[PDB]
Design a protein around this nucleic acid. Structure first.
Length: 283
DNA sequence: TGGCCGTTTTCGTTGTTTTTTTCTGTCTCGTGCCTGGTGTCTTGGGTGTAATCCCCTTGGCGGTTAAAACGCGGGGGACAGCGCGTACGTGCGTTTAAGCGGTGCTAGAGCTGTCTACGACCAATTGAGCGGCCTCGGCACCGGGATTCTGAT
């Protein structure tokens, strides 16, 4: 399991540097331990000696239904909890709609295709609609009020705030059972904030660390990690376990394709976006 | 398809290198000679060697503290790019004097002879300078106040 980074402070790292590591997004001794010097050195106010002391002392201690049956079959029954699933597609393909649907379906009983856990929606694009969550809840006969009470929401204004919310998510996810973490327009802040060309490596490093934190949180809490990508990077490939390509069919009916999964076939399924739901295509 | 730029080549030229031919003076060999280098014998003093001593260099112990090492923020200086203008490179017509060859001449370089002033050397002398001892004041260090100076405002 995890080894929360608090224990690293008893090794004699000072607590301020541990706070800087938590701000960076390292929350376990496992997390600090299996990384090279440069990760800790790149943090502001950390020299090579402090990074070597951290690594040295760290080595001492150490299926959610989509609600579309065709899509569930495409996924062999739904998202695997504990792993990151990326859905990349054009704008208006229904990524946000799928997120809203899953934010409620996660709360469904496991026998009903849920995870019996609360949902987490981190929004960067303003598209969060509690009324859509209410619609999905009424679709499955779930209490809309309890759905909104079991979904904690916060809009990230920048990449630093986007990573900082993970610090609150890790501590908050310990007290209550969650099953779904949603990050909508996850890549948008890396394009709007970091727009220059010399700063590309900085946003790539921040994204890499963010993805590693996502995988860490997935393995730590056994929750589903959902991130949304606008396709107007090869780094996500090794990190994402299931890549879904979304494209528009005219009207409100969307085509979904699987474009990489080591376990799931590359395959396609047709679905629609209905007021209640993300739901099977009904010609 | 039109334009622009990179390139390649090609032709002109021209300055540099290479090949050939005449000469010449500069270099290689021969000769005669004489003086500087070699053999011999001599002395003596300079250098090699041996014993001794002591002083002064090396090594160690300990402390302690000033300086070295290290981290970090930042600012200012190194450096790259760009535009311009002017000073400098190139070429050409003119001229000036550098160079070469001849002729003249005389100051002074160079050699020789002579000799006298002067310096090596030596003995006796003695007083200046050196080794050693002692002391006091210029300077250095401490401390404290005054003044100056720098940078942010």
């Amino acid at each position: 399991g995890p080894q929360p980074i608090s224990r690293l402070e008893q090794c004699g790292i000072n607590a301020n540097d541990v706070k800087k590591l938590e701000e960076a997004g390292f929350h376990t001794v496992e997390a600090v331990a299996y990384a090279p010097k440069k990760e800790l050195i790149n943090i502001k106010g950390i020299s090579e000696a402090k990074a070597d002391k951290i690594l040295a002392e760290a080595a001492k201690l150490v299926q959610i239904t989509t609600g579309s049956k065709e899509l569930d079959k495409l996924l062999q029954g739904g998202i695997e909890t504990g792993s990151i699933t990326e859905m990349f597609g054009e704008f208006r393909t229904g990524k946000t709609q799928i997120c809203h649907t899953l934010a409620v379906t996660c709360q469904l009983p496991i026998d009903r295709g849920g995870g019996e856990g609360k949902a987490m929606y981190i929004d960067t694009e303003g598209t969060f609609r509690p009324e859509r969550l209410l619609a999905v809840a009424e679709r499955y006969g779930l209490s809309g009020s309890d759905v909104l009470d079991n979904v904690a929401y916060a809009r990230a204004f920048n990449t630093d705030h986007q990573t900082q919310l993970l610090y609150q998510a890790s501590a908050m996810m310990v007290e209550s059972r969650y099953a779904l973490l949603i990050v909508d327009s996850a890549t948008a802040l890396y394009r709007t904030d970091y727009s220059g060309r010399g700063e590309l490596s900085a946003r790539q490093m921040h994204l890499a660390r963010f993805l590693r934190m996502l995988l860490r949180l997935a393995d730590e809490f056994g929750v589903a990690v959902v991130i949304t990508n606008q396709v107007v990077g090869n780094i996500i490939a090794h990190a994402s376990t299931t890549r879904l390509y979304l494209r528009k069919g005219r009207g409100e009916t969307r085509i979904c394709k699987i474009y990489d999964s080591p376990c799931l076939p590359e395959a396609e399924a047709m679905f629609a976006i209905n007021a209640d739901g993300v739901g099977d295509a009904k010609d």
